[PDB]
Design an enzyme around this catalytic site. Structure first.
Site, mmCIF file in Angstrom:
data_model
loop_
_atom_site.group_PDB
_atom_site.id
_atom_site.type_symbol
_atom_site.label_atom_id
_atom_site.label_comp_id
_atom_site.label_asym_id
_atom_site.label_seq_id
_atom_site.Cartn_x
_atom_site.Cartn_y
_atom_site.Cartn_z
ATOM 1 N N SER A 1 1.180 -0.949 -0.252
ATOM 2 C CA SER A 1 -0.419 0.111 0.112
ATOM 3 C C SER A 1 0.919 1.604 0.143
ATOM 4 O O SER A 1 0.533 2.571 -0.197
ATOM 5 C CB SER A 1 -0.871 0.080 1.527
ATOM 6 O OG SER A 1 -1.925 -1.363 1.434
ATOM 7 N N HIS B 1 12.017 -14.399 8.216
ATOM 8 C CA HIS B 1 10.743 -15.686 7.499
ATOM 9 C C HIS B 1 11.669 -16.631 8.731
ATOM 10 O O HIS B 1 10.996 -17.596 7.983
ATOM 11 C CB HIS B 1 10.761 -15.464 6.143
ATOM 12 C CG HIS B 1 10.506 -14.468 5.378
ATOM 13 N ND1 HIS B 1 9.778 -15.061 3.912
ATOM 14 C CD2 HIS B 1 10.415 -13.301 5.820
ATOM 15 C CE1 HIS B 1 9.874 -13.319 3.271
ATOM 16 N NE2 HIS B 1 9.835 -12.941 4.424
ATOM 17 N N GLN C 1 17.001 -14.834 2.699
ATOM 18 C CA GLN C 1 15.333 -15.041 3.354
ATOM 19 C C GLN C 1 15.146 -16.523 2.833
ATOM 20 O O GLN C 1 14.511 -16.834 3.019
ATOM 21 C CB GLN C 1 15.026 -14.086 2.457
ATOM 22 C CG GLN C 1 13.633 -13.954 3.155
ATOM 23 C CD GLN C 1 12.875 -12.791 2.280
ATOM 24 O OE1 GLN C 1 12.334 -12.422 1.147
ATOM 25 N NE2 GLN C 1 12.499 -11.440 3.141
ATOM 26 N N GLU C 2 15.765 -16.912 1.773
ATOM 27 C CA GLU C 2 14.722 -18.204 0.827
ATOM 28 C C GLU C 2 16.585 -19.015 -0.056
ATOM 29 O O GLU C 2 16.789 -17.861 -0.146
ATOM 30 C CB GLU C 2 14.079 -17.618 -0.423
ATOM 31 C CG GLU C 2 13.550 -18.270 -1.123
ATOM 32 C CD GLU C 2 12.435 -17.826 -2.114
ATOM 33 O OE1 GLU C 2 12.086 -17.070 -2.272
ATOM 34 O OE2 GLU C 2 11.522 -18.482 -2.323
ATOM 35 N N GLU D 1 4.909 -19.448 2.075
ATOM 36 C CA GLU D 1 4.980 -20.503 0.432
ATOM 37 C C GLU D 1 4.850 -21.730 0.121
ATOM 38 O O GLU D 1 5.609 -22.446 -0.899
ATOM 39 C CB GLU D 1 6.164 -19.402 -0.222
ATOM 40 C CG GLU D 1 6.390 -18.203 -0.257
ATOM 41 C CD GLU D 1 7.977 -17.972 1.335
ATOM 42 O OE1 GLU D 1 7.801 -16.756 1.121
ATOM 43 O OE2 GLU D 1 7.485 -18.954 2.325
ATOM 44 N N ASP E 1 16.931 -16.006 -2.711
ATOM 45 C CA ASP E 1 16.697 -15.054 -2.507
ATOM 46 C C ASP E 1 17.869 -14.073 -1.207
ATOM 47 O O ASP E 1 17.010 -14.462 -0.044
ATOM 48 C CB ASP E 1 15.039 -14.530 -2.122
ATOM 49 C CG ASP E 1 15.005 -13.703 -2.191
ATOM 50 O OD1 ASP E 1 15.277 -12.301 -2.624
ATOM 51 O OD2 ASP E 1 13.623 -13.240 -2.907
ATOM 52 N N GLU F 1 19.440 -13.661 -6.039
ATOM 53 C CA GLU F 1 17.884 -12.550 -6.065
ATOM 54 C C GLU F 1 17.861 -11.414 -5.209
ATOM 55 O O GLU F 1 18.528 -12.593 -3.212
ATOM 56 C CB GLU F 1 16.782 -12.580 -6.177
ATOM 57 C CG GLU F 1 15.138 -12.503 -5.275
ATOM 58 C CD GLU F 1 13.493 -12.439 -5.346
ATOM 59 O OE1 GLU F 1 13.987 -13.881 -5.560
ATOM 60 O OE2 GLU F 1 13.432 -12.086 -5.063
ATOM 61 N N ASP G 1 14.747 -7.858 -7.699
ATOM 62 C CA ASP G 1 13.221 -8.009 -7.029
ATOM 63 C C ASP G 1 13.251 -6.271 -7.140
ATOM 64 O O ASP G 1 12.448 -5.223 -7.127
ATOM 65 C CB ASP G 1 13.276 -8.628 -6.596
ATOM 66 C CG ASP G 1 11.651 -8.671 -5.162
ATOM 67 O OD1 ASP G 1 10.626 -8.023 -5.884
ATOM 68 O OD2 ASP G 1 11.416 -9.535 -4.554
ATOM 69 N N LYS H 1 6.503 -9.392 -11.368
ATOM 70 C CA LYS H 1 5.339 -9.277 -10.199
ATOM 71 C C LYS H 1 4.045 -8.204 -11.020
ATOM 72 O O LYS H 1 3.991 -7.017 -10.866
ATOM 73 C CB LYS H 1 5.784 -8.631 -8.738
ATOM 74 C CG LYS H 1 6.081 -9.678 -7.710
ATOM 75 C CD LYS H 1 6.729 -8.542 -6.876
ATOM 76 C CE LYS H 1 7.697 -9.931 -6.160
ATOM 77 N NZ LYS H 1 8.841 -9.373 -5.176
ATOM 78 N N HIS I 1 4.696 -14.773 -8.420
ATOM 79 C CA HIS I 1 4.133 -15.245 -6.800
ATOM 80 C C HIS I 1 3.814 -13.834 -5.951
ATOM 81 O O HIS I 1 5.426 -13.437 -6.119
ATOM 82 C CB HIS I 1 4.267 -16.710 -6.589
ATOM 83 C CG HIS I 1 4.956 -17.063 -5.127
ATOM 84 N ND1 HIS I 1 5.299 -17.522 -3.962
ATOM 85 C CD2 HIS I 1 6.377 -16.562 -5.607
ATOM 86 C CE1 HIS I 1 6.137 -18.075 -3.734
ATOM 87 N NE2 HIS I 1 6.955 -17.322 -4.100
ATOM 88 N N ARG I 2 3.256 -13.794 -5.227
ATOM 89 C CA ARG I 2 3.409 -12.612 -4.065
ATOM 90 C C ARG I 2 3.124 -14.183 -3.108
ATOM 91 O O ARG I 2 3.363 -14.675 -2.437
ATOM 92 C CB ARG I 2 2.471 -11.642 -4.028
ATOM 93 C CG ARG I 2 2.382 -10.997 -5.053
ATOM 94 C CD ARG I 2 3.576 -10.475 -5.087
ATOM 95 N NE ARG I 2 4.858 -9.653 -4.497
ATOM 96 C CZ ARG I 2 4.521 -7.780 -3.909
ATOM 97 N NH1 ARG I 2 3.742 -7.329 -5.106
ATOM 98 N NH2 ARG I 2 4.934 -7.803 -2.951
ATOM 99 N N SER I 3 3.636 -13.546 -1.466
ATOM 100 C CA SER I 3 3.379 -13.848 -0.302
ATOM 101 C C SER I 3 1.734 -14.479 -0.263
ATOM 102 O O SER I 3 1.601 -16.014 0.112
ATOM 103 C CB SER I 3 4.599 -13.332 1.006
ATOM 104 O OG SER I 3 5.491 -13.119 0.449
ATOM 105 N N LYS J 1 8.661 -18.238 -10.837
ATOM 106 C CA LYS J 1 8.840 -18.087 -9.128
ATOM 107 C C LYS J 1 8.032 -18.561 -8.421
ATOM 108 O O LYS J 1 6.697 -17.712 -8.456
ATOM 109 C CB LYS J 1 9.762 -17.470 -8.966
ATOM 110 C CG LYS J 1 10.434 -17.581 -7.152
ATOM 111 C CD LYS J 1 10.833 -16.307 -6.625
ATOM 112 C CE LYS J 1 10.994 -16.302 -5.334
ATOM 113 N NZ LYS J 1 11.487 -14.959 -5.114
HETATM 114 MG MG MG Z 1 11.740 -11.380 -3.021
#
Ligand code: MG
Ligand code: MG
Ligand code: MG
Ligand code: MG
Lengths: 433, 433, 433, 433
Positions: B42, B157, B165-166, B207, B244, B291, B318, B343, B371-373, B394
């Site tokens: 937002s 996460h 993160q990933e 995810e 990521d 990423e 990203d 995205k 995707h998104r979360s 992804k």
């Molecule tokens: Mg990312």
């Protein structure tokens, strides 16, 4: 043009990353239906059986190529050569039952048969331009279900010292399904915050809910009640609790052995003590429904439980009945339980599913249409709940699209019904005083 | 037949239990499309803004009733009164962009605009009887993507001492997408077993992957490699790793501060040391893609990283690019990265999404559709990946239907393409030499 | 109803008065496509080959009755008996490739195969009611090409002492294709006036341009610049020059032998001197593109040329690549050129054409869709340029309907696209700094 | 179905690179026709006027935006608001004639009016699913024309010492149009070879033929005869010659002044000497047709020419009649000529074109349907020739698609007619005895 011209199966994946069956049906005019078949984590016996390949070189033996082949090479040509109308659901379901020719659908696979059964009905609704709930249930299918929403898991679905498998919230006091869904979601997010602040785990299980390391059953229950209140809702008026005790998983040799999950000091309860214990819990806490509170073979204990609290608490047979109308009929005749968990894939056709729901309803039992542990993007169970004005559904917690897709479909159904929709709240429990 | 006669939005739920926008479009002939919008942001200087209600009495302020109203009361009448053909995608997207009139879609909401954008395209494909990937990409859309599959999470996460993160697996060496999916699933289940035997947590995140309490980054990586091998695949030939890093989340004041997530003793790395570290990792382990390895504003560091390993490792922007063609163009001109994470909801229309993919491709960058979360039962991103012959996607781990639905749609696309399908494996990385 | 019910070929004439193949395709519902096949003046080798009859009693041996028969008696029954959908372009193209079974399409003829390939796509667009560029390229095909317009010819296409085969103008600075076309036409008429006043010939060659007896290369170039200025346009801002050196036609034994066309005193240049010479020309004159500046087998020279001026001048492989993705791939891997001339009939199917364009684009090369010396009333190449957002086209001078028909079709495409059309001008050269 | 719902004009280019009018017509059912208008004249006492813009900032004043606007803003609303059926050709043509209200179509433009006239007829044929020649001419339209094929140009279309503007070949002795076309093409290529070997120019003019520096008229004629023979055909049996003298271009003050084009020593011929000269040529060479052999106002000379050789040589009025039935009627009444060149755009509607053809035929004159110097990809004149069983066409040399497209359409017409086609060869000259 309603004659079925194509029936096609493929192997896809369920929400746990295990193979399952998808079927697509076409008519001469191009009407189309697609179905995906769910799969349970554990299976009651006396049940329709899913066929798996057992080829350990693929998907750890969980492939469904045989079931897919059975659709493509056995069921499909029977339908297409037979020139069946897509509208002739009962005829097609009976044909498949006879084609398999075994009591448990073990030759062709319940997964092959149900994929076709559902895809046919979806294609029929498409042909007619009818909402699926109205095709399935007729013009007066309009009652949205009270959802029993998974929130905390125990037993074999957790590492915490808690014997019961599942704790649920039920937003019975809402005026619409849409409102009920929001209430549940708010409570879920509030619980998550509470868990985080306590340093407990907020990752989710198969149904999208939590399995935190609570101190025991009372901690779990009181923490859920805390979340309900923090979200601004009234426990025992607006929101009630439910259990799935899955008591068969800790019953052996006439004992409800809570030490199996609750450590060495966990109580070993006779059937009488088990009934006393469940009664104590429903007197202490706002519990409106208990699933599998007694063991699947403990019919005397089920009778005592039903006499004890069945007038004011819903008593749901899951493992007790395994969506089997012969077992259900025996239950009804003996005053056993007052509700049945209806698993489409446990019986294997839509015709048989509807027969079971109808048998339950005509006995004054509720029929709770249910998910399985392995779900898919299919949302047919939402339409089945409304088609039959069942009044309740069990389709998961408030995360994971394998659950949320069903809730979204219920939103669409309620929206489409507009001023004709009804949500009966506490009056959904017509099985209780 | 093709004139749009109805455009309708409703509030539904995403995979995290947060509200999102659904839109349905109909034509005069009854062609139909439905879109659901994944989670967004937002706020954010350079991306398109999702509009949320901020009514804390509903969904903790995350309702999307305003965005829904904007579709129903502002966008819909413009479309219907304009008598737009459902085939005129670019016209409709440009009209909405102008109707909002702000650079970030902050008046109507990117979630309102994208819901309409996608639903229109889906209705158009329905009208024409075309697969969506062929409607979107033309006759030659046929390349299935190599999936980069979430498997282990770290950083914000997770609670483990891991800054990144990933961590992902990529089944590059498979001959078809269908086989690639099986490989990933087998690896996922093997990892789950390994984790359980080690007494680590196997519940899943947003995810569908794991966030276990590993000892650190090397433990995580080596354990994933162990799972790849246990499943029977060759690391660095059949299956590669990806990161990521989400390095913006631990970069401050010119320092890549690993102590933010890896405890008090965690390294504080300059940009030069960060590049050295990533180089060391790619030399030690079979890592094919990274990423956000450098901070979103550290363009000098991105340049050094790209010069250092960009010839042999994919470097995905990203947060760097936020699906923004102005920023991407700047990146291309300056030799920054060699891939972009695309995205759809970060930019907000299909037209702009395709423009970004095309800009990337024409620069010799890969476009990784993402995707998104917060996901939904929508599977449009699968078709976008094939439409543009992107070569990579992804879209999550190997559990949760919010992820698996996309993989199932890719199965359907590959099946439908039959002998025309291609899966390019390692040659998908046309950005590497 | 998309099944192909008729495929029919006939012998017609091209723009030079030589026979060529025409094919018509019909579907069950009456959708219709017609294609005519072009033919080159000279052919690169490693190319798909056109089949000619060699019957010296008809058309000096240039009849195409065999290719026509191959469509009517071999390809057509395979398609019709196969019940191929007109939408299944890649399947039909792959089928024809396999049916011929040779690497160069020499059994059935590239002219037979391409006629069917294009007619099928045209019929498919007719069936769907889609503009051909949107059928071919998807919804986002919208970019009109900068045209490289033949204006003066040399080499083997002239008697003047000029080695280069072709000089072109490019109206890069225009805001729309429609404007660009007018600019070119005005310049053409101005040049004609200049030539007439100088007593030079104004009759036209195969591509609709002039081949005047200039004094040499500098005279030709400066006279074109004179025409640009006389028409009121700015050389090197609004309008640029291009060459097609066709250098293979004067390269032998390691020497670029300008004495072949420029008289006894014409320079004999080494590859190094050739690069120096081209560099000198681009420094002196507003030259933005050079086609075949180095010999088709002089890969070292191409590399040097590309290193020397490839950052700021487009270097188009024609004879270098012969629309062959294996040769293109080798070029890309070796840093050879930065553009490819795409000749549909040099490869022989639309699928392969699109594969080549895509390979080029993903390497950061431009794909310049091209005419042949022998053209027809077919305008498919206009739609291919827009379908792929190629950004450039080479389809002739500003006279002869064999050229002008393509420009007229680009006018129609731009008109139909309305506010969604784009003409990127100088930014079309995304291959350059 | 047949009511016209859209009439739309745009500015496109002709074969000389000059703007012209294109019109598209649609019916309620989607029937479609497109017409393009060939070049004309913006002045001329007795013909219909093309409207040009005179904006020297665009196309050197040759834009047709006004004519296009006249279609879009004046003609189109009259048609659409009038609810004219696409089948009502004569009504629509008469309406346009009245709407313009001037004798020469100078208000709306003959180019605006003819574009609509032809596009309507093409849409009507599409609506009915009829070949255009059968829609236009009824069921018995079946006679393919003998083509008079431009081959050598003189006069103001050349720099050679030759007064006559055009020399043609006519493959009268062929059995089919398809064979006639091959004969002409073979002769054309043979001439090209002869010219090259003589060191003469082989570049082409507006009609696709040659304008070589011959020594004079006899050299030109004898060289064409040489080409006919070299191609294997018999002059004066299989293949004849034709002239377009365009004698108005060298007639002044009662003298046919050949010194205007043939140098200082060129003959100054009285009308009597001009007739003697033409008679001498037809006695010496196999000449079957002469166009504009006498000046446009030399009616006494035309009479003498007709009396002298009109029994055995076709005498075509072009400038004499300017497709004007009032002038034609005067010619017929006075025994002037025995053929008329029919230029659709010189009169401006299909109705008036057909009236002129009919008037000619009913007088025992041939009607030779003609191209203009500025042609387009339109092929309507081919269908007009067959519709009226005219027996002759004049549509250019054997190169340039502006010409060849008409010959290709005649191939298609003959193919479609199959066993019903006729090619009357020498019997096409029903005007000769
Ligand atoms: Mg990312
Ligand atoms: Mg249960
Ligand atoms: Mg070339
Ligand atoms: Mg004339």
């Amino acid at each position: 043009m309603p004659i079925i011209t194509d029936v096609y199966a493929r192997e896809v994946l369920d929400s746990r990353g295990n193979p399952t069956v998808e079927v697509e049906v076409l008519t001469e005019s191009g009407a189309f239906g697609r179905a995906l078949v769910p799969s349970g984590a554990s299976t009651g016996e006396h049940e329709a059986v899913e066929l798996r390949d057992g080829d350990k070189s693929r998907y750890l033996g969980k492939g469904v190529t045989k079931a897919v082949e059975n659709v493509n090479e056995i069921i499909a040509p029977e339908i297409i050569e037979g020139e069946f109308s897509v509208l002739d659901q009962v005829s097609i379901d009976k044909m498949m039952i006879a084609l398999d020719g075994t009591p448990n659908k073990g030759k062709l696979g319940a997964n092959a048969i149900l994929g076709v059964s559902i895809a046919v009905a979806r294609a029929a609704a498409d042909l007619l331009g009818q909402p699926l709930y109205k095709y399935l249930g007729g013009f007066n299918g309009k009652q949205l279900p009270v959802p029993m929403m998974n929130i905390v898991n125990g037993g074999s679905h957790s590492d915490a010292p808690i014997a019961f498998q599942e704790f649920m919230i039920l937003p019975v006091g809402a005026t619409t399904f849409k409102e009920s869904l929001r209430w549940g979601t708010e409570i879920f997010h509030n619980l998550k915050s509470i868990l985080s602040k306590r340093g407990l785990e907020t990752a989710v299980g198969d149904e999208g809910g939590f399995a935190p390391k609570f101190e025991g059953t009372e901690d779990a229950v009181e923490t859920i009640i805390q979340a309900i209140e923090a979200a601004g809702y009234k426990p025992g008026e607006e929101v009630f609790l439910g259990f799935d005790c899955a008591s068969s998983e800790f019953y052996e040799n006439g004992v409800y052995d809570y030490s199996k999950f609750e450590g060495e000091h966990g109580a070993k309860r006779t059937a009488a003590e088990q009934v006393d214990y469940l009664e104590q819990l429903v007197d202490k806490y706002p519990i409106i429904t208990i699933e599998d509170g007694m063991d699947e073979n403990d019919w005397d204990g089920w009778k005592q439980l039903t006499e004890r609290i069945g007038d004011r608490v819903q008593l749901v047979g899951d493992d007790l009945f395994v969506t089997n109308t012969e077992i259900l009929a025996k239950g009804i005749e003996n005053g056993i339980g007052n509700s049945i968990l209806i698993k489409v894939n446990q019986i294997g056709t839509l015709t048989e599913t509807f027969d079971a729901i109808e048998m339950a309803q005509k006995a004054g039992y509720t029929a709770v249409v249910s998910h399985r542990s392995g779900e898919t993007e299919d949302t047919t169970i939402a339409d089945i709940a409304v088609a039959t004005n069942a009044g309740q559904i069990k389709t998961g917690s408030l995360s994971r699209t394998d659950r949320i897709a069903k809730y979204n479909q219920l939103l669409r159904i309620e929206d489409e019904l507009f001023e004709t929709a009804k949500y009966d709240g506490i009056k959904s429990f017509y099985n209780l005083d």
